[PDB]
Design a protein around this nucleic acid. Structure first.
Lengths: 158, 290, 217, 75, 113, 182
RNA sequence: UGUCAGAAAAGUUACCAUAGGGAUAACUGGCUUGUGGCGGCCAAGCGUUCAUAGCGACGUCGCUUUUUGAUCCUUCGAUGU
RNA sequence: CAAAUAAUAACGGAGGUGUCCCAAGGCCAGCUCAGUGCGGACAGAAACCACACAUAGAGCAAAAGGGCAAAUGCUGACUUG
RNA sequence: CGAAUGAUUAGAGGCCUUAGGGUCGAAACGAUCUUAACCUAUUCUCAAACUUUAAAUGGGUAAGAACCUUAACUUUCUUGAUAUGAAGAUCAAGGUUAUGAUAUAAAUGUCCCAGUGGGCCACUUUUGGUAAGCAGAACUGGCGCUGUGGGAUGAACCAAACGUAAUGUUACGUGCCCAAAUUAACAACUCAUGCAGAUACCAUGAAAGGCGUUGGUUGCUUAAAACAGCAGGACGGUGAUCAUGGAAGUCGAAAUCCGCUAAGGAGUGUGUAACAACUCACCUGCCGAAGCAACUAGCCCUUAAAAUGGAUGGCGCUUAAG
RNA sequence: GCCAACGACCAUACCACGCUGAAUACAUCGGUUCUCGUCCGAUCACCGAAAUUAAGCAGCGUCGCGGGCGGUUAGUACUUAGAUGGGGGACCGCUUGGGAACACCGCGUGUUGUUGGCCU
């Protein structure tokens, strides 16, 4: 009967990776964080100041604040069963940029590049994503060394 | 040591493996705030050598520092100083050369002239009104030992004489004693104009006159006498204040394919034929057993 | 009090070791794992024969101790004194505890009736898996029939069921007998006691001519 | 007599009924616990917008009277 | 999967389910068919469906208004098979029922329609 | 091995810049325990060297010699460069320059020890007492400050780095000693 | 203010009382069997000689709750121990 | 334990707390630790001096865990955030 | 686990100068090195409080007017020497709202509204405990709170949730109880002398066997005449020795070498005190066709012992009604 | 082809050796009056010029170690979901998807940014 307290169970959460110990690379402090930016939390065990508490590791929020060393990130925690949006002041070394939306934003960049040159053709602009449709009718040619090439089900004996 | 701490071996970065960077200071020199979002900070980098003084202005960007102004000591022959390129005196020129090199291209030489009245006092430029102040640098010394009177502090007073706003204290200027401070501009003024290099070569024709052919050689070749240095450096402090034009050269265009020497390394077909005859002629040599 | 493994037959739990965290673990009275001519070379004993578990049992230390002696005493009686190497490949680092209830004098009431349960380590056992060997005897091919009966006599002292496999290997090395014979027929099998050394192309080259200076000379 | 404490049984049936409830999406989220020197006369970066188009596209040529600030902003 | 069987309908199975069993959704209510005006009054201004064979077309050949052609319908409240089932809790490929029957959804719709 | 070397020889790779001079000489007096005995032992080296020496403290406790943590047992100093060649050869003819064989480290330094400290041109002077000393001669070529600078450091390599058998080679020539195979 | 969201607090009752409790012991009944014993395999060996006439080590697989624990399910408006 | 987010029980298992600290806090600078090898009179298994290797195998009031090498370790400088 | 930390098993190659002393030698270095240390290439087996690696099922976020690119304004706080930053406030320009499927109507307040705050069962994962119809947890589904169909019976299992009716169609079943097959449907398996066997959960039964029968895998002999049987020898070159219960063809047994041909065993034996013979090999027969073992897993048997009389639910079934 | 200062990623860059090296450089190097610091001008600080096969980033070489990427292990191990499946149990088969790891073999052995120069 514990969780309680504050870095418990984080023997593997705030560990370092293997041979990624030591000095922090310098671009970690050279990243720019503007208000309203999507941001993951993966805490740094080698920076003992401004670590998020363990519920928020692995999560994802939006930057609501910038101060001199940290960003306020607003993160969702399910406190059962309901979702509060938690405001967590977290230092910059524990904070990353989300890649999730900058491969949505390279489609807004193409839902206006492809609708641009569609002023000549007209249609279909085809600006929606399609799931993996079932395949087609297609003519598999053999030739290729005609078949059989015939498996039979056999591997036991030892 | 044998295959198994090599597996667990984590190198240091690349430059701390090679002595170049602190990274405990590089972390703290290149610190910008996060609510100062992408503003550069432009530190002042004077690195010494044996026969060069590289002064630079670089700002912290991710894919490398970007160098915005670079004045060396191997160009001060163009301004009237032929030898003694790594002086305490010859740094204040490259200090002052890199400040006037950057305020003309930033247009900030009409305002922020500087200190041509070179005295050795503490000099902190008050901001010219109708707007904020001047270009700020911060001094980046590396791991030069910052004891009082080093030549690395001989480019901070050179650059602050051009007019740049680099934050100060005179504690490490040559001629400010340690009990107390005891400001004394005159030993700083002596060192600025190269007096105590002149005084040593005015004290060496009294003790050991043969040692001119030793230390302070090539003053004998180029004819620089000891009473000239207080006016060699003085007339250089306006010939530098009149032509800071970056020394840009145009070979046009001889950098790539020069001309003959690509230095290929043993394409793996050769290495597998290198150990074709290395293996075949060994057992033929072992057929000279029988 | 050495109660047998007769009623142990749901075994559940992650292996508690004899480590720096339950210190008080005893010296084992079951120590030796291998016997016979254990100084024989690779070339002496071509035949390997295993006793292989086709269940998921929990073989006891006293079961494994008993089964080695019955495999020993038949082989030193029939196929020669030192024509075998028995390797008992199940080293039992397990802790089975016991809640002992010191209930002498019938009156004390203090220690444990059902509250509370710290244990005391008495057992030591080996998990086997399907297809996983239990002991391998290495001997010649003249005594192939004498080998299997000593493993048969060891079967009836283990729980579960077990299958006696003549392996097609050449000894305890992980080679086919043909692939052992081909690879030893040029240079590449540089022998040791139990095992050979393998097929070296690396590194760097100094131990290639040392082979070639000892294939010709 | 000491019966049965602690279970998360029924606790997600019972928490999925009135459902598991995202907060709600606002156009105006609060500025509180935010950097106060970022806010305190950016209150007056709003209050300096006395006009925004009439007197303001006058300014595009009022500073192009001095040809803008095209060079010296480059430090 | 274990609560469901599916497969790939014929044209005849598309028709017989909409002819015999096809009901339709009219302002949240369930309205049988009985004429083409129940299909046309809700899918001809927006989509181009007025007949029954319209609704059989853009369901069978999966057309661009399939989303509307199949949410217009109510779920087909089928009968029970004649001869009944096979096991109901094994896969079709085990010994029979749930999952993809794949062409044998037709034979089972003859029993249910 | 037999990797191709190709050995381009524009000059025979001799050693003008590879001097194998004396770096420094280490002079220790490991007195047993503290008190005023080190003070009268420390002043024998300002007589010998001129530099005032340093008071090395004992690291561990032993209870067998009587030393503890920080009990100031020894006195040492170091002499570097052409002033060692006073105190080297002045204490080497005491050892009658012919010296033992090991006595010669694999690291290239070598050293010896003499008792009877008044054979260094020192008058006997019973106000201080006689002492036994510890002479260690570290030895090196130019470029050995490559690992000593704080900025842009490095390591010396194989050649240069001088063996035992080139300190002996330096000793059969300078002072003309014999190596005394014992 | 450690009973740590924080009364100011020693026993005994076989002379006993009350409200309840099978949310809770004492015995029966149930499940359980570590403990005892009764079986079957393998055979080191004992038995002058002979492995099983009679035995039978180290192992091994079961049966047996009744002693005996463990348990708290039924009964405390009472199942006579 | 705990079943790869967090949560999670038993009189489950292994321990720790009720303190210590004018430095063991703050910060700059210099420095490299465990051990190992070849050496140097008394001096040995260890005393000290000195060279070479040392991925932290040391040390950090820390119970365990994480973390840390021109440091958060060792030494000095001023210091009281 | 031929990576660290912890274990742990065996050898192999060696630095050596650690020897535990050796060995041929007073110690020897004049040689074998003897072994054990130490080093190096391997090796067996492993970890609730180890881990380079690393799933499945999971956790979070995103998937557009609340948007995307502009233009130039505001700012003291805001930063910059920039009233280009960074936030904000405006005008400009932008085909087809930017996966799928759904919409039981969703949103939001108030009575902080009543009851509740003993739970219990199950798959899977789990801890304690020898075990438990025991103790404690995670997950989802259930009983509580719920009838009805099936499991004879039954809180929970399988199916299915329920207005009042008519008709038709459905997992468990179809010898009789009892609705529906003693199936104009089959192929096999099995004989059980005191519970043959008979539907999940589930109402127990093992290890190990069977020249009981059924199928199967491996190896020999074979159409050179085997297999079986009626028909021959089996003594000995010799109590070599081992040996006196005693080994003369034989307990044990270091040891191990010999008859003859068509063809005979220093030979296993209760103990034939020690001897004899004898006969399961060899091989000439007749026979003249398949024989031999070893192994495997179906059913049945065996292993298999309780107390009122008794339970596949009952009857009863045996080319089944298992 | 390179050289330097400042870097980013932080072993494809490391480690062990071996062998080259034009030119700018970078060094080692010389000295202690000055500023500065040591027990010591070795280190640090400062003045600044008399010889090169050590640093240095390399040019590299290595059937190199490590590290890196691919292949193969392997549709293997495990695992989602299912059954009135099996078995006395332990556990195992199949259905429905998902899908590793060591090793093993092969491959390559820093990539580049800004600013100043050199041209074999």
């Amino acid at each position: 009967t514990n969780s309680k307290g504050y870095r418990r169970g984080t023997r593997d959460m705030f560990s370092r990776p293997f041979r990624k110990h030591g000095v922090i690379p310098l671009s970690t402090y050279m990243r720019v964080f503007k208000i309203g930016d999507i941001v993951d939390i993966k805490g740094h065990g080698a920076v003992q100041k401004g670590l998020p508490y363990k519920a928020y590791h692995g999560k994802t929020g939006r930057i609501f604040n910038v101060t001199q060393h940290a960003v306020g990130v607003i993160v969702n925690k399910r406190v059962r069963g309901k979702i509060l949006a938690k405001r967590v002041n977290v230092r910059i070394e524990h904070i990353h940029h989300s890649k999730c939306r900058e491969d949505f934003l390279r489609r807004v960049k193409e839902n206006e590049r492809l609708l641009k040159e569609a002023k000549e053709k007209g249609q279909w602009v085809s600006l929606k994503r399609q799931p993996e449709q079932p395949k087609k009718a297609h003519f598999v040619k053999k030739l290729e060394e005609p078949i059989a090439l015939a498996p039979i089900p056999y591997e036991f004996i030892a | 040591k044998n295959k198994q701490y090599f597996k667990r071996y984590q190198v240091k970065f690349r430059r701390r493996r090679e002595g170049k960077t602190d990274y405990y200071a590089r972390k703290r020199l290149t610190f910008q705030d996060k609510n100062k979002y992408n503003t550069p900070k432009y530190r002042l980098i004077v690195r010494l050598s044996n026969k060069d003084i590289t002064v630079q202005i670089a700002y912290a960007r991710i894919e490398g520092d970007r160098v915005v102004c670079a004045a060396y000591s191997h160009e001060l022959p163009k301004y009237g100083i032929q030898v003694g390129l790594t002086n305490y005196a010859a740094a204040y020129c490259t200090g002052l050369l890199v400040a006037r090199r950057v305020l003309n291209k930033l247009g900030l030489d009409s305002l922020y002239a500087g200190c041509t009245e070179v005295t050795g006092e503490e000099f902190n430029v008050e901001p010219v009104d109708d707007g904020p102040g001047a270009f700020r640098c911060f001094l980046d010394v590396g791991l030069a030992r910052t004891t009082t009177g080093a030549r690395v502090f001989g480019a901070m007073k050179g650059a602050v004489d051009g007019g740049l706003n680099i934050p100060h204290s005179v504690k490490r200027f040559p001629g400010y004693s340690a009990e107390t401070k005891s400001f004394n501009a005159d030993v700083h003024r002596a060192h600025i104009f190269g007096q105590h290099v002149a005084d040593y070569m005015r004290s060496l024709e009294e003790e050991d006159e043969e040692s001119f052919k030793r230390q302070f050689s090539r003053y004998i070749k180029l004819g620089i006498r000891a009473d000239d240095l207080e006016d060699i450096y003085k007339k250089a402090h306006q010939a530098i204040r009149n032509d800071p034009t970056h020394k840009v050269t145009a070979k046009k265009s001889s950098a790539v394919t020069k001309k003959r020497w690509n230095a290929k390394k043993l394409t793996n077909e050769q290495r597998k034929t290198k150990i074709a005859a290395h293996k075949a002629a060994y057992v033929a040599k072992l057929q000279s057993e029988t | 009090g050495r109660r047998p493994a007769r009623c142990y037959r749901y075994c559940k739990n992650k292996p508690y070791p004899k480590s720096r965290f339950c210190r008080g673990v005893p010296d084992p009275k079951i120590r030796i794992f291998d016997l016979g001519r254990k100084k024989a070379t690779v070339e002496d004993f071509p035949l390997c024969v295993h006793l292989v578990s086709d269940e998921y049992e929990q073989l006891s230390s006293e079961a494994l101790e008993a089964g080695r002696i019955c495999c020993n005493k038949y082989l030193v009686k029939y196929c020669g004194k030192d024509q075998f190497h028995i390797r008992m490949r199940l080293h039992p680092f397990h802790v089975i505890r016991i809640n002992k209830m010191l209930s002498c004098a019938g009156a004390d009431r203090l220690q444990t009736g059902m509250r509370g349960a710290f244990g005391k380590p008495q057992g030591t056992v080996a998990r086997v898996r399907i297809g996983q060997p239990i002991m391998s005897v290495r001997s010649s091919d003249r005594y192939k029939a004498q080998v299997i009966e000593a493993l048969r006599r060891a079967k009836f002292k283990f729980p579960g069921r077990q299958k006696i496999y003549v392996s097609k290997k050449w000894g305890f090395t992980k080679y086919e007998r043909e692939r052992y014979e081909e690879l030893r027929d040029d240079n590449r099998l540089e022998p040791d006691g139990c095992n050979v050394k393998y097929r070296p192309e690396h590194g760097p080259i100094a131990a290639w001519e040392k082979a070639q200076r000892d294939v010709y000379a | 007599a000491k019966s049965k404490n602690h279970t998360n049984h029924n606790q997600n049936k019972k928490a999925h009924r009135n459902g598991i409830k995202r907060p709600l999406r606002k156009r105006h989220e609060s500025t509180l616990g935010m950097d106060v020197k970022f806010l305190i006369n950016q209150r007056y970066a709003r209050k300096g917008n006395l006009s925004r188009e009439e007197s303001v596209k006058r300014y595009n040529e009022r500073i192009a009277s001095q040809k803008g600030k095209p060079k010296p902003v480059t430090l | 999967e274990p609560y469901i069987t599916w497969g790939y309908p014929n044209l005849k199975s598309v028709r017989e389910l909409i002819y015999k069993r096809g009901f339709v959704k009219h302002n949240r209510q369930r309205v049988p068919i009985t004429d083409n005006f129940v299909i046309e009054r809700k899918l001809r201004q927006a989509h181009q469906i007025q007949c029954v064979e319209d609704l059989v077309h853009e369901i069978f050949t999966v057309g661009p208004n399939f989303k509307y052609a199949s949410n217009f319908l109510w779920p087909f409240k089928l009968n029970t098979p004649t001869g009944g089932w096979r096991k109901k809790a094994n896969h079709y490929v085990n010994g029979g029922d749930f999952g993809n029957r794949e062409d044998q959804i037709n034979r089972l719709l003859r029993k249910m329609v | 091995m037999a990797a191709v070397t190709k050995k381009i020889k524009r000059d025979p790779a001799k050693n003008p810049m590879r001097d194998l001079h004396i770096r420094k000489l280490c002079l220790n007096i490991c007195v047993g325990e503290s008190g005023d005995r080190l003070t009268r032992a420390a002043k024998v080296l300002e007589q010998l060297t001129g530099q005032q020496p340093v008071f090395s403290k004992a690291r561990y406790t032993v209870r067998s010699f009587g030393i503890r943590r920080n009990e100031k047992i020894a006195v040492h100093c170091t002499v570097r460069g052409a002033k060692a060649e006073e105190i080297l050869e002045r204490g080497l003819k005491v050892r009658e320059y012919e010296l033992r064989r090991e006595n010669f480290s694999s690291t290239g330094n070598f050293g010896f020890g003499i008792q009877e400290h008044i054979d260094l041109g020192i008058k006997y002077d019973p106000s201080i007492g006689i002492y036994g000393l510890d002479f260690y001669v570290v030895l090196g070529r130019p470029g050995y400050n490559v690992n000593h600078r704080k900025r842009k450091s490095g390591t010396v390599g194989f050649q240069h780095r001088l063996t035992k058998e080139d300190a002996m080679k330096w000793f059969q020539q300078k002072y003309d000693g014999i190596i005394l195979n014992t």
